[PDB]
Write a protein that binds this ligand. Structure first.
Ligand SMILES: Nc1nc(=O)n([C@@H]2CS[C@H](COP(=O)(O)OP(=O)(O)NP(=O)(O)O)O2)cc1F
Ligand SMILES: [Ca+2]
Ligand SMILES: [Ca+2]
Ligand SMILES: [Ca+2]
Length: 341
DNA sequence: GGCTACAGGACTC
DNA sequence: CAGGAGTCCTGTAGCC
């Protein structure tokens, strides 16, 4: 088939840039301020300007400020990027109803029944970048190919404001050369493991004994990687349905005392419940990030919908359980709701 | 043996 | 110096 992957550029940063065009040209850094102290927090995203100097998502805001003391540091406004993202998705629908929105930032379009070959494809790619440019003034990178993985990779390879095609020929080219750590779903941990057995390329999974690979990375990944090696990988582009909604907050200071954690936990529930909108969850999970940045959680599934009232009460137990089954101090607390009726 | 819930792990954006 | 949100998978144990 033919998948055309769409990825917005420095989305959070660019959105901010669209609303305040004077930001144009400067290093913009959208961050998540934790409130613990002047500049505590991490980076959500940074435009290419901030990026070329090492400012990337996931690092502490304090770090970013050393490298770029005079960079614009804006606080995250996710609801604005969401209203903006939504508008762009609706446009993409105008190009195919077999559309998979993977995130607030990416969309997969199965254009198997629109373009005959990769040529009208590349063309439809251009037609879309322009449409989004004339509509919302947002640059996006377009990745085209036979399956979702390579379309995404195509895009990774062309950003930003790009558009690349990866024909069947290059798919074999890449299966043999592309760095396996560069394959969607392969993080450092798995990558190490992989390139711990030569595996530095997809095809290498074709040579090794299945159980050897399956014993190291699991049945799902060994198959995922193998299916890609054989150029036999297919995953339908499907309407994605949210499976869970939650909220988590950082406490002004670590602690293990229950009365000092409830306010946070309870507010997490207020917002969570807000977002559920009209969804009724049957499972609730209390998620706690320990002082050493570990993650412990306790959940519960009910045979019925959970009222905010019940969510409140049950969360206290799960938290209790957590505390009582681990002796570390919490740093963040939150709740996640799932299994919607 | 395999299906369920639950808790941990890994990854991603 | 370590934010926020969400998905998929695996190991363990209860159960048929
Ligand atoms: N650690 C992260 N925290 C975040 O909040 N984000 C958010 C969630 S979606 C939005 C995507 O931003 P951007 O498009 O800049 O990230 P990419 O990885 O797509 N880089 P791009 O090539 O500029 O898109 O960034 C991403 C992250 F990677
Ligand atoms: Ca992305
Ligand atoms: Ca993006
Ligand atoms: Ca990687």
């Amino acid at each position: 088939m033919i998948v055309l992957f769409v990825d917005f550029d420095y989305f959070y940063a660019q959105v901010e840039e669209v609303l305040n065009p004077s930001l144009k040209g400067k290093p913009v850094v959208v961050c998540v301020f934790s409130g613990r102290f002047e500049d505590s927090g991490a980076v959500a995203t940074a435009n290419y300007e901030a990026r070329k100097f090492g400012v990337k998502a996931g690092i502490p805001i304090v770090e970013a400020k050393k490298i770029l003391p005079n960079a614009v540091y804006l606080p995250m406004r996710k609801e604005v990027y969401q209203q903006v993202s939504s508008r762009i998705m609706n446009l993409l629908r105008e190009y195919s109803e077999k559309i998979e929105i993977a995130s607030i930032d990416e969309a997969y379009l199965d254009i198997s029944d629109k373009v005959r070959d990769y040529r009208e494809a590349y063309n439809l790619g251009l037609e879309i970048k322009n449409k989004i440019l004339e509509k919302e003034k947002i640059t996006v990178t377009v990745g085209i190919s036979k399956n979702k993985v390579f379309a995404k990779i195509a895009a990774d390879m062309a950003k930003p404001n790009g558009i690349k095609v990866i024909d069947d020929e290059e798919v074999k080219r890449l299966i043999r050369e592309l760095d396996i750590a560069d394959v969607p779903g392969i993080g450092n941990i798995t990558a190490e493991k992989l390139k711990k057995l030569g595996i530095n390329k997809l095809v290498d999974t074709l040579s090794i004994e299945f159980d050897k690979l399956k014993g190291m990375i699991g049945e799902a990944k060994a198959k995922y990687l193998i299916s890609l090696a054989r150029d036999e990988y297919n995953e339908p582009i499907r309407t994605r349905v949210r499976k869970s909604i939650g909220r988590i907050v950082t406490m002004k200071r670590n602690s293990r005392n229950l009365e000092e954690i409830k306010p946070y936990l309870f507010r997490a529930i207020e917002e969570s419940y807000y977002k559920l909108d009209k969804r009724i969850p049957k499972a609730i999970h209390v998620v706690a990030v320990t002082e050493d940045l570990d993650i412990v959680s306790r959940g519960r599934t009910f045979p019925h919908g959970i009222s905010k009232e019940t969510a409140y009460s049950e969360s206290v137990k799960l938290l209790q359980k957590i505390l009582e089954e681990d002796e570390r101090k919490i740093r963040r607390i939150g709740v996640r709701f799932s299994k919607f009726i």
